[PDB]
Design a protein around this ligand. Sequence first.
Ligand SMILES: *[C@@H]1O[C@H](CO)[C@@H](O[C@@H]2O[C@H](CO)[C@@H](O[C@@H]3O[C@H](CO)[C@@H](O)[C@H](O)[C@@H]3O)[C@H](O)[C@H]2NC(C)=O)[C@H](O)[C@H]1NC(C)=O
Ligand SMILES: *[C@@H]1O[C@H](CO)[C@@H](O[C@@H]2O[C@H](CO)[C@@H](O)[C@H](O)[C@H]2NC(C)=O)[C@H](O)[C@H]1NC(C)=O
Ligand SMILES: *[C@@H]1O[C@H](CO)[C@@H](O[C@@H]2O[C@H](CO)[C@@H](O)[C@H](O)[C@H]2NC(C)=O)[C@H](O)[C@H]1NC(C)=O
Ligand SMILES: *[C@@H]1O[C@H](CO)[C@@H](O[C@@H]2O[C@H](CO)[C@@H](O)[C@H](O)[C@H]2NC(C)=O)[C@H](O)[C@H]1NC(C)=O
Ligand SMILES: *[C@@H]1O[C@H](CO)[C@@H](O[C@@H]2O[C@H](CO)[C@@H](O)[C@H](O)[C@H]2NC(C)=O)[C@H](O)[C@H]1NC(C)=O
Ligand SMILES: *[C@@H]1O[C@H](CO)[C@@H](O)[C@H](O)[C@H]1NC(C)=O
Ligand SMILES: *[C@@H]1O[C@H](CO)[C@@H](O)[C@H](O)[C@H]1NC(C)=O
Lengths: 220, 214, 654
Amino acid sequence: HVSWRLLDVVTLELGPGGPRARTQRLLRQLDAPVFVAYCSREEAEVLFAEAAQAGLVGPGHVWLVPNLALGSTDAPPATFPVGLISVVTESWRLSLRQKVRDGVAILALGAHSYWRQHGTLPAPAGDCRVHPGPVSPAREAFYRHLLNVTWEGRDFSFSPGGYLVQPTMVVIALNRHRLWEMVGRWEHGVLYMKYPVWPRYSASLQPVVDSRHLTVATLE
Amino acid sequence: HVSWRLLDVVTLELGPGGPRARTQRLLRQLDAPVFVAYCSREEAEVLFAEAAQAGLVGPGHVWLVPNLALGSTDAPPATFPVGLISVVTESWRLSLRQKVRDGVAILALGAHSYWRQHGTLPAPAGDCRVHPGPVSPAREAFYRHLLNVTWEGRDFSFSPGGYLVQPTMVVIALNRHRLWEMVGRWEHGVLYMKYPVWPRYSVDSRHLTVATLE
Amino acid sequence: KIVNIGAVLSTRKHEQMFREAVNQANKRHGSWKIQLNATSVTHKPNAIQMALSVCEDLISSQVYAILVSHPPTPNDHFTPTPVSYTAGFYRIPVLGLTTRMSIYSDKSIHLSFLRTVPPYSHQSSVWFEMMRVYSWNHIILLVSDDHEGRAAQKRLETLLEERESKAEKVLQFDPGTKNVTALLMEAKELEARVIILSASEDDAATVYRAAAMLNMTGSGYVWLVGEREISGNALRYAPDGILGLQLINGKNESAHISDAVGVVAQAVHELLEKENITDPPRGCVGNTNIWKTGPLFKRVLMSSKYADGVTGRVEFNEDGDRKFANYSIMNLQNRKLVQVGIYNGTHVIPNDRKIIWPGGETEKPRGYQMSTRLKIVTIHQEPFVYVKPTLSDGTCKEEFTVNGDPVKKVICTGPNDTSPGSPRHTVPQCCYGFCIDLLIKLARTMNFTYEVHLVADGKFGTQERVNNSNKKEWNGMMGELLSGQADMIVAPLTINNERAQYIEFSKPFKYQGLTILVKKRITGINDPRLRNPSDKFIYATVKQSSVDIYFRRQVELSTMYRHMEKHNYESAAEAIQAVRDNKLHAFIWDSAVLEFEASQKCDLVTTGELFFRSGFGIGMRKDSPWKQNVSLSILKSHENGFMEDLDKTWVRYQ
Ligand SMILES: *[C@@H]1O[C@H](CO)[C@@H](O[C@@H]2O[C@H](CO)[C@@H](O[C@@H]3O[C@H](CO)[C@@H](O)[C@H](O)[C@@H]3O)[C@H](O)[C@H]2NC(C)=O)[C@H](O)[C@H]1NC(C)=O
Ligand SMILES: *[C@@H]1O[C@H](CO)[C@@H](O[C@@H]2O[C@H](CO)[C@@H](O)[C@H](O)[C@H]2NC(C)=O)[C@H](O)[C@H]1NC(C)=O
Ligand SMILES: *[C@@H]1O[C@H](CO)[C@@H](O[C@@H]2O[C@H](CO)[C@@H](O)[C@H](O)[C@H]2NC(C)=O)[C@H](O)[C@H]1NC(C)=O
Ligand SMILES: *[C@@H]1O[C@H](CO)[C@@H](O[C@@H]2O[C@H](CO)[C@@H](O)[C@H](O)[C@H]2NC(C)=O)[C@H](O)[C@H]1NC(C)=O
Ligand SMILES: *[C@@H]1O[C@H](CO)[C@@H](O[C@@H]2O[C@H](CO)[C@@H](O)[C@H](O)[C@H]2NC(C)=O)[C@H](O)[C@H]1NC(C)=O
Ligand SMILES: *[C@@H]1O[C@H](CO)[C@@H](O)[C@H](O)[C@H]1NC(C)=O
Ligand SMILES: *[C@@H]1O[C@H](CO)[C@@H](O)[C@H](O)[C@H]1NC(C)=O
């Protein structure tokens, strides 16, 4: 319902060898407090460094990027402003062993659901000598039966598209030590937040809290 | 003794050649029925081109510009919108000969006015080399004597800062023929007029006509 | 691409120092892509020949930036004028190593200019910081008539209006004058107790000796001055205890050279790559044109964030200011100076030992010398203020009340014995009422001394744009309060937005509103007789009242003003007789007094309830020192049933 008054949409070229004058000219003239950008890690590093050149990395501006960037999730590279915001799924810190175990578990539970439904699992057809891809009739039923699953408090789900639908997700940020720390949770369409007001840091912590905001106390 | 419901103030910066990207959006955002501008002539030309690109140029809006811009009265420049208002002093009769006739006459009359009552003819200063005259002698009052003056009906009353006060001056506008034409003047009293109504001369426009009865 | 710059200097030894400094600073980079150079000349007495020499320097090399300094000659303001004017014709950047005058700060007369040392305006900001340290809020700004004076006054005005508390009676005196005693004597009356001065050194000595003759350098007071008021020969007339401040490392400027080339170096290697630089203006004759890139170079150099010069981190402001220069605070400790504080932009550190004030007291002295004899103004109001003629013995009836306790009365002067027509009769009347008892209680609690006197206008006072068009000065009583005719106001006075700007109010002590009066019946403001005025019924109010403003600011109700402005008794309780005369039917006024009228008199009825809420209250001038205490006192009385008892005694038994 909110208005969401857009300011401007800007598309830029950022190749490893390219015209820096054009990008610098297009970036130096801007006016907005919040940013959303879609780029890769090798893209985000260069663009973030160039933005750091033209004075836009203070505690007044905030950046939000999707899960495409920040691939490392364990070694956050340089030139990344403190306070970067992105959103990732669950298993954000689950072990690789734990992850593969969970995958085997959900596959096994789907197989068990199929036997309870009819009795056993289907035979495989994996001849990479013939590989006819003959017909669907039976395997599609197994696919549709496996389409839904839930195991050990982890409520998975799926759509016709090969991507799970409506899981519990998290919103993470960067602490004052260049480290990923959980900030918010997201379950069932209701959104929480562990910080009532966006802590803004300056050159080194010492949050220069704004002059137009205050804390009102009241009672029932 | 009026309201003057001012809308807002906007500050612009432009390097017209390349850096005017954000200026386009900033000029798009505004909304007001009366505009008053202040810039230089080439800056006026680029600003009005950018305004025409943006679209806030319709006849339902009026532009107002001081005498600092639009200096070339004797030549109507291109890319200028018809029907703006600018204000100039009494200069329609001005020319080379007009300025020549004005200057020497006023200077000589000022040289004689102080002589009219116990005075003597002045003498020049020393030179541009010796750097003389640290103090201000009594002859400086002669310069002060060049404050009050009058000739040819036109009042040349001066001010302590080096300019004239209580002046006679006119208000001009650009008609459809692309040539400066007289619109009004302020002859020491209240405003006059030659066109009692604004002709808004030239499809998704404004200032629609409304006819009614009481 | 050999990039060439220049720098003019004074003593011909700093010229050799500059040559060595620039050739050493050339060692920053030597990649053969960019090179540097220098050329130095010295000054001369004549201005015109000096400017011609600057033109010769201009032609002799396609220069990039000129640098200027000051010679040991005492001709201050005539030093840097020619170079800026001449080099401005081609947008050639100029760097003033040391010049503190205010005029150069304007980028409209010297459009090409950059400075490293701040002008005299910026030090005023330091005062504000100091002003916040010890909680001083009433000032006496003393300044001269020079352009620097106007600049300082404007800077202090905007910086005060940031917090927007007040300024207090700034007064300016002509430069280079004698016997300034008149203005000082005129300003000595005010209750403020701290002065600020910034003028010429000889003017500083003159004002020092004049104040010594007028005995203002004594105890209790404190006044601080700028930078040059504690230099030259001004020490020969200065008393002990006056604050002073200077810049950390000024007047040396040799180290300043080590900064300038630095930043220009930090400029040149950042400019030659933009797009199409390729040329400065070559020649000094015939080529009537400007540099094609002058503004670009100037703007890029202005926003340069230099790392580290000799004088800390140096930046520039929007016009070319010093951007966080340093300042040292010295005290006139028995005809000497002691560095007591370090100002670096955010505060002043009191790292020193002890500061001595002009009074000799070692504790922080506050200003706002509290007066003891006030000037109280009042107004005739029926149930609140009783005024009577005196018995020729010397007072009026001294007798008991219904309870037998003496009703306390004072003696107030005031009117002209006739409001509508009389020349004047300023006579003493005897003066007693509810507010008089409240004032007696207040004076008993706060050790006061009162001299009550009435108003001459007979009206409260509103805004009035007189036929002599100007700012609408307040009328009557409020004009008397503001002009200084009065100092405190005690009366049944409303508290509205239109009055809150210039006045400070206390907590309201009696809640009240607006109500109608008729002599029988009627209704509130809903009847068509009031929506459409009738020739039979007449609606009138008291002229020059708050209700006039209330009906003068309503969009839909505007037309009622059209009726009200037609005929309204510019009068008082006398207009009460209008309802007795059967002429005016409806009288719209305040609830308390009009309701007391119904009880005291007869055949007068009030209809319905109120249609507006306000309150009475004691008012005083903007940010008076008493406010808190007085307000507290009132509230304490409201706790002890004092207000209820007074209410009972005065308007209950009726
Ligand atoms: C305005 O311009 C007129 C045009 O010349 C100037 O006239 C000034 O008028 C005053 C008025 O009295 C005159 O002052 C003279 O003062 C001496 C004092 O002894 C007296 O003897 C003379 O009879 C005369 O009153 C004088 O004509 C002239 N002022 C001066 C200083 O010469 C003047 O430039 C302007 N008016 C003023 C008041 O400055
Ligand atoms: C959701 O899971 C349920 C069981 O967990 C499955 O629903 C079965 O689907 C089979 C496939 O034809 C049919 O027997 C019935 O539609 C369902 N049977 C039972 C006993 O539930 C299936 O995996 C998912 N649901 C659907 C509709 O596909
Ligand atoms: C002007 O400033 C310069 C630099 O701040 C002063 O030179 C310094 O003097 C101190 C003390 O003698 C030395 O420790 C530094 O090494 C010097 N620096 C340089 C770069 O030479 C100079 O003395 C000052 N001159 C005056 C008259 O104050
Ligand atoms: C200027 O000097 C002041 C006082 O000497 C410094 O103020 C301190 O700054 C720290 C942050 O660095 C803050 O905790 C306080 O504002 C001050 N500390 C105190 C009072 O203990 C300031 O850092 C200096 N530098 C500037 C303003 O750039
Ligand atoms: C406001 O009231 C306070 C307290 O009534 C006053 O402070 C007192 O001042 C006297 C004399 O200066 C001292 O003897 C008392 O000790 C002070 N009280 C306290 C609690 O310390 C203050 O002076 C009053 N201010 C004004 C402007 O009236
Ligand atoms: C460099 O400066 C010297 C100083 O005299 C001057 O002679 C020479 O012409 C200059 N050369 C350039 C390329 O600026
Ligand atoms: C001039 O100075 C004398 C000093 O004796 C003083 O009495 C007089 O008031 C001064 N006049 C003015 C106008 O200040």
